[PDB]
């Protein structure tokens, strides 16, 4: 009855808008095209899509959101779901991001 | 450098093939994991590694900075203490310069060893200060 | 037929180099992104 | 230029750049100094610190005797920048960058 997430790794080096992980030692993995949360506080997170899955296990990233305030040596959950956003008809006459935030 | 017959014996196989209690990507703080851990299994002895490592992390405290870069282990006298295989490990990243990887080569050893042993490690996340408390 | 033929001898002057850099980043970035191995050789035995 | 220490030998030479291997220990050369090549027992050629590596490889651009230099030299570090002579001691006279007459 834990709102259980899956820890894939860490963050290793940012450079821009973009970021690459290393896996932790005897983890499930993560998923090619898949949505990731970088944990920049304990209970606020910075959306990452996966690109690159290199022979060495690093992971490449596209970040989103809040990337000023990831850090390198922050924890990665993998939510291990495609990017699904917000649709409908009470969308309309609103402005929205990709990620679907008003 | 003199290493011992049997760790000449290992290095010159196909170890890398071999079977391990977990599958780890391959990488380069993998390669000398594996390497550890294949010689430990044939002694049976596992601890003795680990001990190693934590010798090896006091010495480095001592160190001058950038102790990896200008790195001598033959001449060292704190790695004068440690196993055969760990001290040739060692030389063996010293000789490709690699001996920054020595904190986490032990965390993949450390990782094998606790699959072999069948424990599972939880990390407990607490604020500097705030571990007195892990009751919960 | 003097201003149009310095355009021509200007443009291709400039099309051969930035193919060649093209080329040349291409090759750049693979090499970059190959990394060398362990060394397994007879460390010791020198 | 006067010399103080050894910082290295030299490894790699491609044309006028080249490129040295740390001496024991890595004692360091400053950034944009001027080094001293050991060509000959005697001759010293001049060579100027561009990039200074992780591993402690010295990126060096050569400036004279360029032909003289070789792979396993000695490498000697004046740690001061580039400075010439200047005033009116050299009015009417020839010289080159390094201020050799």
């Given at each position: 009855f834990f709102k259980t997430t899956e820890m894939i790794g860490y963050v290793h080096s940012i450079d821009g808008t973009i970021a690459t992980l290393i896996p932790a030692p005897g983890n499930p993995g993560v998923a090619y095209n898949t949505i990731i949360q970088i944990q920049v506080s304990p209970t606020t997170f910075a959306a990452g899509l996966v690109f690159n899955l290199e022979k060495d296990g690093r992971i490449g990233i596209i970040l989103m959101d809040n990337i000023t305030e990831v850090q390198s040596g922050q924890k990665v959950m993998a939510t291990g779901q495609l990017l699904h956003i917000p649709v409908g008809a009470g969308v309309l006459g609103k402005v929205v991001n990709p990620l679907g935030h008003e | 450098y003199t290493p011992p017959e049997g760790l000449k014996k290992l290095y010159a196989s196909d170890f890398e093939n071999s079977k391990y209690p977990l599958n780890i990507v391959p990488s380069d703080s993998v390669l000398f994991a594996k390497f550890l851990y294949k010689a430990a299994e044939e002694?049976?002895?596992?601890?003795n590694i680990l001990s190693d490592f934590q010798k090896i992390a006091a010495a480095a405290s001592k160190l001058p900075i950038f102790w990896?870069?200008?790195a001598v282990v033959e001449k060292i006298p704190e790695f004068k203490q440690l196993s055969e295989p760990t001290f040739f490990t060692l030389?063996?990243?010293?000789?490709?310069?690699?001996?920054?990887?020595?904190q986490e080569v032990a965390e993949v050893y450390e990782t094998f060893?606790?699959?072999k042993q069948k424990k599972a490690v939880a990390k407990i996340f607490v604020a500097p200060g705030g571990e007195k408390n892990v009751e919960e | 037929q003097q201003r149009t033929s310095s355009l021509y001898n200007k443009t291709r002057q400039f099309g051969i180099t930035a193919a060649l850099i093209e080329i040349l980043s291409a090759m750049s970035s693979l090499e970059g992104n190959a990394m060398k191995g362990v060394r397994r050789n007879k460390f010791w035995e020198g």
């Open positions: - | 002694k049976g002895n596992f601890d990896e870069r200008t030389v063996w990243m010293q000789n490709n310069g690699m001996l920054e990887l020595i060893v606790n699959a | -």
